[PDB]
Structures are given as C-alpha cells and as structure tokens.
C-alpha cells in the first residue's frame, strides 16, 4: 500500500476540487435571514470528520454493534432545541448562554469562570483531535511521518482562511454534505459484495484473529484478541459488559443536553433564521439525516476487520508499532484503510479531498470563536481602556498559543483508553461537563435559586471532576495482561456511571446552599424563567426575528411531522433489540 495514490487519475481531482472551493470563497468575498435547508446541513455536519470517520468506525471494528445507538439519542435531543429552548433565548433578548446567566443572576464572576472553562474544553476536545485526524489521513494516504503532516495540514488551512473561507460557509457546507453523503453509500455497496452478503458477514466476523499471537517468550491470552460473545446486542449487561444499558440511555442524554443546547456556534446558527417555521424545518431535516450512520459508518468497520485482520486487529507490541505508530492498539486505521484499498481510480481522490475539506472548516470556526471569547470577555475586563489596534494584535497573538499547546498535547490522545478515540472524548466530556447542565436547568425552571448557590455548585463539581481526571492520566488505564494500580474507589466504576453521580451531587449542593440565603424579587425576573415567560410589564434588571409568531397551518404540519419522526426512531430501537443472535458452546 501507500503507493496506490501515485497515479494521474485522482491528483487532478484533488487539485480541481480545492481550486473550486477557493474560487467560490474568493468570489463570495466581493459580491442573515436564512431558510430551512442550509440550517439542516449546517446542523448535521458539525462533528463529522473526526467523530464519524475515526471514532464510530474504530469502535465498531473493536467492540461491536452497540455504538450506533448514539445518533438516535442525538436526534431525540435535537428535537428539544427547536421546540423548547430557542424561544427562551428569543423572548429574553440574549444571544449566548453566559450573557443569559449575567442577566439572570448578576455579578461578574460566573461569566468569567464559564469562559475560562470553555477554553479548556475547546483545547481538550476539538483542536488536538482535528489535527490528529488530519495527520492520520495524510500518513495513510501518502506515507510521511507525523511531524511532516501536521505542518502540511496547517499550511493548507492558512491558505483556506486567507481567501475568505469564513464568509461563504453555506454553499460549501451544503455541497460537502451532499457529496459526502452520496459517496458514502457506494463504499457500503462495494463492501457488502466482497464478504458475500449479509449472512456470511455475520458468520465470518466471529473468527477474525491475528496470526502472530506470540512474543519471544510471552504467549498472549485467548480472550485478548477474539471478538466478544455479545457483538450483536444493542442493550448489554449493566454490571459486566462495556457500554451498559443504564449508562447508554441516561449518561448520553446528560452529555448531549450540554452540547446541543448550551453551545455557541449552534445557537447563533439557529438564532439567525428568518422566521420561527424555518428553525423547526431545519431541526426536522437533520433528525431525518441522523438515522444513517449505523448502516453507513459502523458496519464498514466490521468489514474492514474481516478483510485485513493482521493490521486492524494486531495484539503483539513489536508488530503494532510498525503499522500505526503506537504500541497499544491499532483500531483507528479501520476506515482509512477501506477507502484506499477498495475504491476505484476515480473516487479514491475525491473521498480524501472531501474529508480534508470538511476537516479544515471546523478548525477555522473554532479559531474564530475562541479568539472572540478571549478578547471580549476576559482581557477587556482587566484593562477597560484599550483601543482597536491593541485588541486586534491581542486577538491575533492568541491562536499561536492555542496551536502550540494543542500540538504539545497530541501524544497523549493517541495512547489513551487502550487506543480508541470514542472513549477518550466521552470520558473527558463526562469528567468536565455535567455540573453545567444542572445549574442551567435549575436556573431556568425553579425561579428561586440565586447567585450564592450556582457558584459553589460549579466549583464543587469542578473539584470532583478534576480529581478524577488527574488521577486517571498519572496512573494509566490498564491493559490486557497487566491491570492498572488505580485506587479503585474513585477509579472503579464505568465513566458513564460518573456523569449521573456528578449531576446529582451538583444539584444537591446548589439546592442546599440556595436555601440558606436571601432571595431575589420578581420585579427583576420578568421573561427570564419558565413561569414568568408571558408577563407584559417592565423589569428593572440587574431580517431579525424577535416575536416567535407563525401562521396557524404550518404549525400543524410541523407538529405532525415531528410526531412521525419520533415514531420512526422508536421503531428502529424496537427492531434491533427484538432479534439478536446467541452463540453456542
């Protein structure tokens, strides 16, 4: 491999696609109130590129079939943003979430603390993961090492963002979603023809083992490379199986409620629509599109394990370092090996071009949002008398610091949680996210909390999560032959049984602290909670829609279509749990 790209039939395809995208941006640089179809594609492609092509396919090739029930929970939580939470942001005159928590409670410490937390979550979750995924794609396709691929990815995204790649982010986004969704079905059709149908795919996956199992003297265990006994179950054992069904339903809901409703890019995307019917149309279209990645991206991971078993399922550490560069595991190369070694001479370049052009826009979006969040909300509250030139050079001397810190952090990403990228992202989110959602829901619905409770709730949740996160990396997670010497009190349970405990403890602390101090009168709290959302008086506080009005026909049509989408998702969940296979001894 690695010399299958050196032909004249697809280098021209890569060059022509990149010149087309840069020409579209350079034309839209010279010469608000959107409609339903751009919002749907902009919401469906938010985390694709590194949370669809690496994480889902690798955990499908390593664990089994239960990973695919992530997007169905995501669409159920996507229907709540349009119907419940966006009229709260419109009816209060607010754009983002810390600007809501400044107008609700008061003071100046909650906003600064939430900005400082959001920057660290950006660094740990998005930037280093995007750079690592781009380096994986370049190292599989061409053949250079890691340090010669990171600087190539950065030197291409700089040319992307110079020629107006942030203005025109609607045409190129709809184009990339359409081309990627069309091209991801032909690879499934090519994959299911190679193994020989759907029954031989079931019968052959349970015998995919490597043929080099021994060391020089350390013969490896029998259970360490054979597939699991429950690979075709959706709901697994709640005590001894990975991804257990209580965590799989409750902890993913707690982790998705923070991500879909209290974000910054998604909320400002939905708040820029023309009317209130178009937000709901855009929320229905992405929910219809999020039913596919079980059949499109999880099941080709198992085909990639079946066809090439000595690379994707290696176990001996003198052999796994030769193939993927790390001595822990090699499941991350499951999907980029299928694209290079099965596609014909034409589409093999177009798929790599689509994946890289979807990986660069995310990066520019993050670099712009973090620059605004640092300059406006932390640095301008220290000096208070800064001009525009000083703020421009401060905003431009910050992304260099972010890039250097993320590139330094990368060699911990590629060796965490035994070599999988789904578990790393979900465990970091489970340790740092759940104290925010409890304080958000208790601020909206209960009307009696004040500023003295929310701050100490956030601080105590931060202390617990940071203790577990520091103890996890300094001791390691463990292995197959030698388990880890973790203190097995805070380190014993699954990482999805930690989110529920942290959620409950943060809520209990803010209620107990809030019931011991002075309240806030309801003169200041008009149209800022759920009970007083329809008051008409004035409050003495501490192209563009502002009304949330709609015709009485399209309201009925949207209600009926949301009910039908919920029925389809429930039927899929009831199909894959009613007939699952059981092996014999």
């Amino acid at each position, epitope marked *: 491999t690695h010399e299958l790209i050196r032909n004249a039939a697809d280098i021209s395809v890569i060059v022509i696609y990149f010149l087309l995208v840069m020409a579209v941006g350079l034309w839209s640089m010279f010469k608000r109130s959107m409609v339903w179809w751009p919002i749907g594609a902009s919401l469906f492609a938010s985390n694709i590129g590194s949370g669809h092509f690496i994480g889902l396919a690798g955990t499908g090739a390593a664990s089994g079939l239960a990973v695919g029930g992530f997007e169905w929970n995501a669409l159920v939580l996507l229907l709540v943003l349009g119907w419940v939470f966006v009229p709260i942001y419109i009816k209060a005159g607010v754009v983002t979430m810390p600007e809501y928590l400044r107008k609700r409670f008061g003071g100046q410490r909650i906003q600064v603390y939430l900005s400082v937390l959001s920057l660290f979550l950006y660094i740990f979750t998005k930037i280093s993961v995007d750079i690592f995924s781009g380096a994986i794609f370049i190292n599989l396709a061409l053949g250079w090492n890691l340090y010669l691929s990171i600087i190539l990815l950065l030197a291409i995204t700089a040319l992307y963002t110079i020629t107006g790649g942030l203005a025109a982010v609607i045409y190129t986004d709809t184009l990339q979603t359409l081309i990627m969704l069309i091209g991801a079905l032909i690879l499934m059709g090519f994959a299911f023809h190679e193994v020989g149908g759907y*029954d031989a795919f*079931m*019968e052959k996956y*349970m*015998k995919a083992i490597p043929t080099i199992v021994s060391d020089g003297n350390t013969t490896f265990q029998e259970k360490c490379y054979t597939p699991r006994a429950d690979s075709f179950h959706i709901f697994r054992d709640p005590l001894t199986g990975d991804l257990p069904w209580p965590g799989f339903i409750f902890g993913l809901t707690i982790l998705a409620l923070w991500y879909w409703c209290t974000d910054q890019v998604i909320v400002q995307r939905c708040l820029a629509a023309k009317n209130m019917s178009h937000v709901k149309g855009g929320c229905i279209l992405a929910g219809y599109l999020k039913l596919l990645p079980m059949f499109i991206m999880v099941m080709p991971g198992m085909i990639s394990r079946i066809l090439f078993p000595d690379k994707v399922a290696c176990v001996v550490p003198s052999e796994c370092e030769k193939y993927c560069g790390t001595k822990v595991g090699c499941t991350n190369i499951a999907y980029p090996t299928l694209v290079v070694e099965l596609m014909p001479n034409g589409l093999r370049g177009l798929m790599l071009a689509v994946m890289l052009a979807a990986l660069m826009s995310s990066l520019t979006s993050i670099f712009n949002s973090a620059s605004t969040l640092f300059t406006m909300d932390i640095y301008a509250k220290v000096r208070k008398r800064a001009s525009e030139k000083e703020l421009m050079i401060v905003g431009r001397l910050f992304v260099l610091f972010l890039v250097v810190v993320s590139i330094a952090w990368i060699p911990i990403v590629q060796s965490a949680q035994s070599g999988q990228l789904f578990d790393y992202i979900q465990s970091v989110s489970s340790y740092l996210a759940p104290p925010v959602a409890a304080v958000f829901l208790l601020a909206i619905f209960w009307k009696r909390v004040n500023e003295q409770g929310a701050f100490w709730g956030l601080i105590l949740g931060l202390l617990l999560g940071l203790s577990r996160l520091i103890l996890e990396f300094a001791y390691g997670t463990g292995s197959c032959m030698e388990p880890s010497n973790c203190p097995t009190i805070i380190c014993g349970v699954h990482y999805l049984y930690f989110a529920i405990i942290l959620f409950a403890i943060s809520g209990i602390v803010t209620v107990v602290v809030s019931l011991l101090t002075k309240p806030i009168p309801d003169v200041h709290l008009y149209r800022l909670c759920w009970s007083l959302r329809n008051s008409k008086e004035e409050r003495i506080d501490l192209m563009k829609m502002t009304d949330t009005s709609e015709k009485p026909l399209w309201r009925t049509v949207l209600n009926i279509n949301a009910i039908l989408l919920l029925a389809v998702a429930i039927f899929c969940h009831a*199909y894959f749990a*009613s*007939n*699952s*296979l*059981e*092996v*014999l*001894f």
Partner: nanobody
Amino acid sequence: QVQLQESGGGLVQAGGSLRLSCAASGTIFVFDKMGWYRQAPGKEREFVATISRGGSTNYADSVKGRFTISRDNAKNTVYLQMNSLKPEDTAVYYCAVRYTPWRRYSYWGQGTQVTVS
C-alpha cells in the same frame, strides 16, 4: 459454509413408523425455528411441523395427533417421530432453519425420499 446432513428415509407399509433427523454443522450460532416442509411429486409445498427454541410446537391440522417433534436443548439437532403411516403421505421432505424471528428462512435442506406401500 453451513450444510445440513439428514437421514432416515425408506419404505414402510400402511400402519408403520419411521424416524427422520437433521443436523446443521459448520456454524457458531443457535438457530431459532428448525422446522419441516414436504412436497408431493408434481404438486406444491406445504407445512408439517416446527419447534422453536424455548419449546412451542406448531403442527398442521391435517396431521395433528400422529406426528411428534422434539429438539435437543441449546444445540442444533431435531427429530421427527412419525406414527401410524398411511399411503397418502408419500413425498420428499426438506429441513428449514432460521436465525432470528423476523428474517424468513435462511438455509434449506437437500431432500429425503420416503414412499409407503
């Protein structure tokens, strides 16, 4: 590949008995609904007997009372004890299996010839 080996054909008189077997080999799973299907020479197929996994036998109304079918537990072997034979039920017999309750009869058997009188 999965293949079904069966045996137990022959020739009896009107009022005898026989014994038919079926045994899949080469798989790793447990089948759900191992059954039987007969077909007269020159006619169309029909249903005879069927036993599920936990045990729920489902006969046909024109044969109930004379046939008895039993399957071993947690493995793939199913018998059929036919009693008081007539010369009307002379046909070949197939053996069908199934993976899951909603998936429509994956593998079929070869065929065992049995005629009477």
